[PDB]
Chain A
Amino acid sequence: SKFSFGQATPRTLLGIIRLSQALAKLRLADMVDIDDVEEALRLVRVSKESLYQETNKSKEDESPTTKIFTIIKKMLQETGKNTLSYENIVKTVRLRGFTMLQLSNCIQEYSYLNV
């Protein structure tokens, strides 16, 4: 890419350890917690993200039909059949938290396009 930085050298791994150990000295603690590792890794990501702009977009809250489609992919991974009789997928949707009325509308929608 255009923002080709340096290679992941083993010296960069020891730098996070030295930054995490120095953060514990300011808090007067003899043990490094999880907060010291996340704070040391944040300073490295900031210096590396100085070239990119401040435009970040993220969206992942669509219809719940996509979550039900992930359960169908689990059955195709173990078997791989597109039959109409589905008696094991209904037992997995009930354990999640979805209703049985919305499940029948999702199976009929996918069966029309043969998925």
Chain B
Amino acid sequence: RSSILASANPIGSRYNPNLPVTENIDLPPPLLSRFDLVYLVLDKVDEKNDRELAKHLTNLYLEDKPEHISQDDVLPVEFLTMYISYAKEHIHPIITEAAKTELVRAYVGMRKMTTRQLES
């Protein structure tokens, strides 16, 4: 009982925009429906995005510690592990009647545009 976090890749190492998702990747159709979130991170050529991304990576190599970022904006690794282990042993959310009504309406609207998407 564990989650699977993998990263797929296309055949020719280039996601063609004029090709379907099932044809670009050699993954079985049943394997694609078993996942919960199928993100598609593309490498779009943008001048406004490559300029800000290069400045962020250059600031990490100039200073070993983020002095420009405040301490209340980035949480340490020791505090992040204590927030997940504590909530996974005491916090137990219960689906109420108002929350269960919107989940049924959202599942019908998605099919009008499998049962694995309902549990996700």
Contacts and interface: CB of A to CB of B under 8 A. Distances in A.
Interface of A: 7-10, 13-14, 17
B53 A8 contact: no
B45 A13 contact: no
Interface residues of B, number: 7
For the residues of B in contact with A, the DSSP-based class is helix
Contacts of B14: 7
Interface of B: 14, 43, 45, 53-54, 57, 61
For the residues of A in contact with B, the DSSP-based class is helix
A7 B54 contact: no
Given A7-B43, A8-B45, 7 more contacts: A7-B14, A9-B43, A10-B43, A10-B53, A13-B54, A14-B57, A17-B61
A18 to B, nearest CB: 11
Top 4 A-B pairs ranked by shortest CB distance? A8-B45, A7-B14, A13-B54, A9-B43
B13 to A, nearest CB: 9
A1 B53 CA distance: 29
Contacts of A10: 43, 53
A7 B10 CA distance: 14
Contacts of A7: 14, 43
A17 B14 CA distance: 25
A9 B54 CA distance: 13
